C-alpha cells in the first residue's frame, strides 16, 4: 500500500531512478554469477531484456511452473522464488545453478521451441511428436501417455500378464470348476 | 456541516482535543456575536444547529 508522498521535490528523479535500479542491481547480481540462461514464470520486462542482450544471456518468460520444477530436477538448479539469504542482504550463489550441455531454441513447424540437452545433474527425457493435423497429434500423445503409464506399472511391479485375453480365457474355466465347491446357489 | 472540505492531521492527542474544542468554539463565537448583537429573533435560509 506504500504511498509515496513528496514534500521536497528535489528527489522525485532519484526515486524514479532507483525504481528501476533495484531491478538493475538484481539483474547484475544474477549475471555477475555468470549465469547465461534464465527462466521465469513471472513477467519479464523490456528493461531486463535489454540488459540481458547487452550481457548476451538467455531469457524466457511465462514458463509453466511444472516445467521449471522439472528443469531444476534435471539440471540440478535450485528453484528460487526470490533472492535472499540467511542474512537479510539479497545475494545469489553459483551453487544455485543447474547445468546442461547445450540449450537451443529451434524452429519446428515455423514455431520456435526451446530445447535443453543433457543436463548433467539428472538425465531428463522429453518427446516431440510430429504429425499431420492437431487431431492425430493429440490423440497420439494420449496414446503415448498411456504407454508411459503401462511401462511405469511394469517397472514398478516386476510382473507381467500374457495379453490377448488369456486372462479370462483361463479364468472362465477355473472359476467354472471352483463353482461346484460352494454347493450353495 | 457543509463548510469548506478539509482533511486535518494532528500528532498530539491534546491537539486533537483542542481541534474539536476549536470547532465548537467556532459555533460558540458565532452565537456570542449573535447574542451580544442584542437581537432576539434570528432567521436563516440555511439550517440551524440544534
Amino acid at each position: 500500500g506504500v504511498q509515496v508522498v513528496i514534500t521536497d521535490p528535489e528527489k522525485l528523479d532519484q526515486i524514479r531512478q532507483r525504481e528501476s535500479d533495484i531491478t538493475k542491481e538484481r539483474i547484475q547480481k544474477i549475471l555477475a554469477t555468470g549465469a547465461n540462461v534464465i527462466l521465469t514464470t513471472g513477467g519479464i520486462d523490456d528493461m531486463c531484456l535489454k540488459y540481458f542482450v547487452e550481457a548476451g544471456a538467455m531469457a524466457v518468460r511465462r514458463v509453466l511452473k511444472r516445467d521449471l520444477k522439472r528443469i531444476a530436477k534435471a539440471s540440478g538448479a535450485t528453484i528460487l522464488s526470490t533472492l535472499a539469504n540467511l542474512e537479510g542482504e539479497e545475494t545469489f550463489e553459483a551453487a544455485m545453478l543447474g547445468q546442461a550441455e547445450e540449450v537451443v531454441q529451434e524452429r519446428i513447424c515455423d514455431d520456435e521451441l526451446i530445447l535443453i540437452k543433457n543436463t548433467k545433474a539428472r538425465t531428463s527425457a522429453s518427446i516431440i511428436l510430429r504429425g499431420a493435423n492437431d487431431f492425430m497429434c493429440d490423440e497420439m500423445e494420449r496414446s503415448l501417455h498411456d504407454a508411459l503409464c503401462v511401462v511405469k506399472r511394469v517397472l514398478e511391479s516386476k510382473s507381467v500378464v500374457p495379453g490377448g485375453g488369456a486372462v479370462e480365457a483361463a479364468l472362465s474355466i477355473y472359476l467354472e470348476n471352483y463353482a461346484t465347491s460352494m454347493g450353495s446357489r | 456541516a457543509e463548510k469548506d472540505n478539509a482533511e486535518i492531521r494532528v500528532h498530539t492527542v491534546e491537539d486533537y482535543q483542542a481541534i474539536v474544542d476549536a470547532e465548537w468554539n467556532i459555533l460558540y463565537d458565532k452565537l456570542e456575536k449573535i447574542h451580544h448583537s442584542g437581537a432576539k429573533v434570528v432567521l436563516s435560509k440555511l439550517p440551524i444547529g440544534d
Binding site: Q3, T7, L12, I15, E19, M47, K50, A132, N133 | -
Partner: protein
Amino acid sequence: LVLSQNTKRESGRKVQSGNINAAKTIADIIRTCLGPKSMMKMLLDPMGGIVMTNDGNAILREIQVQHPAAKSMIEISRTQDEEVGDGTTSVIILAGEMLSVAEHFLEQQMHPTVVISAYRKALDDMISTLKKISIPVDISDSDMMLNIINSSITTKAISRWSSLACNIALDAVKMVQFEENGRKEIDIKKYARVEKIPGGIIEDSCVLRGVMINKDVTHPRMRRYIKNPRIVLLDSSLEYKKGESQTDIEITREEDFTRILQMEEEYIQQLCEDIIQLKPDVVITEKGISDLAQHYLMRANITAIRRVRKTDNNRIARACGARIVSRPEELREDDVGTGAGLLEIKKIGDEYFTFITDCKDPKACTILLRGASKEILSEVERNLQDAMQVCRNVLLDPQLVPGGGASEMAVAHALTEKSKAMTGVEQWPYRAVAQALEVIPRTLIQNCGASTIRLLTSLRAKHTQENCETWGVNGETGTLVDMKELGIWEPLAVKLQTYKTAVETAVLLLRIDDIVSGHKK
C-alpha cells in the same frame, strides 16, 4: 432418455463411406487448380473483401465445413502449406485419390488395420525410392537456384514475371542468414517483410536492401535525405512517464509547482543530451516522443521517427546491425546505427515512406511489392511466400527430385516390383497405393486438355524402361517430356512431406468408424 438427449450417432460402413465421400469432394473442389496450366481461383470472404489465389491452402482456409473429416483435411492442407509453401497445390488431391482407391478394399470386407500396415510399408518404400532418385545440387550456383524457383512458381500468376520473381526470392533469402550458430546458422522468414503498395507496375517492384517504414518525419526540420546516418533504437518512450508506484506530491511554497513543472522538462533534456553524446543521426522508437525532446533533437539536427511496430523495430535493427536500447543513459556506441548506406523519406503519392538502403552486409530485408491493386498484390505476395519458402528448403537440403509426375511414376513401378515380389493379402493394397499415385500426372493432363488415357499409358510404358526416370509430363504441350531438358525441378523435402502427410491422412481417416455429436462443453 439415456445417452445425451440430442446427440446423433452413426456407425460402420455408412460412416466409412461418408468420410470417403467427404474426402473425395474435398479433393474434387481443387483438382482443377493444379499445374502450370492451372486455373485461377477467387474467394468471397465473410466480411467483405475479395481474395483470389491459386494456392490451395488459402482456398481451403476460406472454407468452413460441417462434416468433420473435411475439417481434418483442411488442417492437413494448412500444415503442409506452413511447412513447405507449395505442394498443397497437390497434397489434398493426392490424399483424396489415395482414399478413393482405398475405399475399394472396404467392401472387400478387408479390415482397415491390415490395409494401414500396408500403407506404412508403402510409405517406407516410397521414401527410400525417392531418396534413390534424387539429385544433389550446388547451393552457391545462382542460376540453378533461379531455375528451381522458376520451376516451383510456374503454376501461379507470377509466371510471366518469372525473372523478377526469381531474382527477388534469391536476393531476399540469400541475404538472411544469422551466422551466430557457428556453421549451423538458420534463416528465418519473419524478417523478410512483404509490403503491398498500390500503383505502379510489377516491374517497379524490387528488393530494397533495408526496411520500409510507413511513417513520416515528426517535424519539418529533420533532413529527409542522409548519406551515412547513425541510428539509435529507443525501445523506451522518450517522454515523461507515470510514476508507476502511484506517487503523489503535496507542495506548499509557491515556487514548488513551477519547479516540479521544470523538473520534467529537465528530465527530458537529460535524456536528450544523453542521446546526443553518441553523435547519432536517427532516432527510432516504438513508443511516443515528446515534442520537447523533439525540439532538442531538432536542435541537434537529428531525425526522429515515433511509434513504430515492434517487429518493424527488430527488422530495422537487423538491417543497420545496431541493437535495440531501452535506456538512454545506458546507450553504448556498440549500438550506434552504423551500416545504413542511405537514409531517405520519399513520397509514394499521398503518403510518406522511409527508405534505409545500401547496408554494408544487411541481414534483414523487406520486399517492396508494387502492382495494380491490393488483392492482386496479395496473390503476388502469397506466390512470393511459396517461392522463398522452397528456396529456404533448398538451402536446408541440396537434394532435388524430377517432378512433373516423373518421380510419381518411378515410385509407381518400384512399388509394382516390390508388390509382385511381396505376395500376401497386403499385396493388393500396396499396388493400389501405387496406382493411386498415378493421378498427379493425370490431373496435369486434364488441366492441359489432352488424351488422358493414351498419354498416361505411354508414360507408364515409357517408365518401365530402367534407363530413364526423368520422363515427365509437360504442362502445356501435353506430351511426354524427359524432365532434364524441361527443367521443372523441385526440392526433395517438398515431395517427402507431401507423401508423408498424405499417408498420414490416409491412416487417420481409415481408422475412423463412428460419429458422435453435441458435446456441449
